Amino acid sequence: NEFLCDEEIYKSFVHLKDKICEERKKKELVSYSSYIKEMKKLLKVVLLKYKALKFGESNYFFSSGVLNNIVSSNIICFLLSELILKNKLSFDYLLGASYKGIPMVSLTSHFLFESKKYSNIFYLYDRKNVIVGNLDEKKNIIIIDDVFTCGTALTEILAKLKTYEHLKVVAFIVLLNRNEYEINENNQKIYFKDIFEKRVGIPLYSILSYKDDIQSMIH
Amino acid sequence: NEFLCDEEIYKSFVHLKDKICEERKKKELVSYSSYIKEMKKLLKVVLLKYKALKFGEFISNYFFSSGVLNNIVSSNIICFLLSELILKNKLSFDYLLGASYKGIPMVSLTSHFLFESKKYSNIFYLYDRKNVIVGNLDDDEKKNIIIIDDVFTCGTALTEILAKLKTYEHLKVVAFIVLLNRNEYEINENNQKIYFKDIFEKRVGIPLYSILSYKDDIQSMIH
C-alpha cells in the first residue's frame, strides 16, 4: 500500500484549504497560486491512489467514478469553487452535468457558500422537465463536469438549454482538460478547447490539464 | 416575502446543528429529540417558502416536489438530518447510494455531514443510472448500502433500485432513508389501516426511516 492514507490526505486538504482562502482574502496572488499548486499535487496523489488515472495504451485512461468519495470530492469541489471565485465569475445558477457533475454540484455549492458572499446558491441538473431546480434579465449558468475532450457532452447540454429563453451559460468548469488537438496545414496543433470556445462563445476553465499536470506522471 | 429570509434560515440551521451534535455527543436523548424537532420546524418553513409543499386537490390534498430544494440553504437542513438519522440509529454502512436523480445531489452533501462526526476515515457514495451502479466498487463478506431518496409512497422507486442491485452479488441494502414518508395505506377487512411502509418493510426485509411524515408533520399544515 503505496499512497498517503485518507486521514493524512484530509489533514493536508484542511491545511491547504485554509491557506488558499487566507491568501485569496489578502489578495496575495503569488502565494495563492502557489498553495493552489500544492492542492493540485495532493489531488494528483488522490487520482493515482484511487486509480482514476491509469497508464499504458491514448497513453492514459481517466475515470471519475472512483472519485465519489468525500475525501476526494472535497478536494475537487473546493478547487471548482476556487476557480469560480478567483476568476470572479458571476452566476445565478450552477448546473451539474448529468451524471458525473451532479454530486459535484451540491458539494461545490457548499464550498462556495463558505465565502459568505451569497445568501444562497441555487443548483440545477439535466436529465438523460429536462432541467431541474429552482427555475422560473437572463439568468446566468456555470456548468460543471468532469472531463473535456472535444466538448461533445457540453454541446448536448447547451442544446437542452436553448429551449429555455431566460437562461444563458457564461462558463464551463471542469476537473480535467485533456488538451486534445488536430494538426493543421502548417504542422501546428490547434486545440479543441480553442475551437469550442470560439464556436459557442463561452470560456472553459479546468482544475487540471494533460499538459501541465498529467504528462509529467508518464515517464 | 411572508417567510424567514435565507440569511435567517441559515443562522437558525447553524445554531440548531450545533445543539443537535452537542446533545448527541452527550447522549442526552430528550434534549436531542427536542432540538431535532426544532430543526424539523425550520425545514417545514423551508418547504413552504420554496413551495415544495402545495395545498389543494391533486392525483390527495397536498402535492410535494423536491426540485425546489436544490439550493444549499435547503439541502443543508435536509442532508444534515439524513446524516443524523444514520448516526442516531447507529446504522453501519460501507456505501451510501443516492437514488437517481433526486438522491444524487443529496448523497454527496449527506456524506459531507456524516464525515463531520469524525467517525470515518472516508465515505464512499454510489448512484444508479436511469455499468448501472457508479462509484468505488471492486465488487462484481457483503458490503452494506444505505439508500437515500426524497419521498416514499408504496416503494416502487426503491424496489427498482433493489432490482438493479440484485445483480451485484457482494452488495446488500441495510436501510432506506427518506425525506418524506406519505404514510399511504389500505383498509382491511376490520376497517384498519395497513400502511404500505409496513408491507414494504416486510416484503424486502429492510427498514425505512424518514425525516418527515404526513401524519406527524404535514397534516397539521392543512386546516
Residue numbers in the entry:
A (entry chain B): 7 to 36, 59 to 85, 94 to 164, 173 to 180, 200 to 282
B (entry chain A): 7 to 36, 59 to 87, 94 to 164, 173 to 182, 200 to 282
Paper text:
Specifically, P. falciparum orotate phosphoribosyltransferase (PfOPRTase), the fifth enzyme in the indispensible de novo pyrimidine-synthesis pathway of the parasite, is of special interest. OPRTase catalyses the conversion of orotate and 5-phospho-d-ribosyl 1-pyrophosphate (PRPP) into orotidine 5′-monophosphate (OMP). OPRTase is a dimeric enzyme with two active-site pockets, one on each protomer. Once the substrate has docked, two different loops, one from each protomer, cover the bound substrate to shield it from solvent.
In our crystal, PfOPRTase 1–218(Δ37–58)-H6 packs as a set of four catalytic dimers, leading to eight molecules in the asymmetric unit. In the present crystal, the individual PfOPRTase molecules possess the conserved α/β topology also seen in other OPRTases. The PfOPRTase structure conforms with the conserved PRTase fold, having a 321456 arrangement of β-sheets. There are 2–6 sulfate ions originating from the crystallization conditions associated with each polypeptide in the core dimer. The two most interesting sulfate ions occupy the positions where the phosphate and pyrophosphate groups of the PRPP substrate are expected to bind. Remarkably, of the 11 active-site residues at the core of the human enzyme, five are different in the malarial enzyme. In this larger tetrameric structure, a protomer from one catalytic dimer forms an inhibitory interaction with the active site of another protomer but from a different neighboring catalytic dimer. A β-hairpin formed by β8 and β9 (243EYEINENNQKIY254) inserts itself exactly at the substrate-binding pocket of the recipient active site. This completely occludes the closure of the hood domain and would prevent crucial substrate interactions, including π-stacking with Phe97, in the hood domain. Presumably, these intersubunit interactions blocking the active site of PfOPRTase occurred at high crystallization concentrations, but they hint at protein–protein interactions leading to autologous catalytic inhibition of PfOPRTase that may regulate flux through this enzyme.
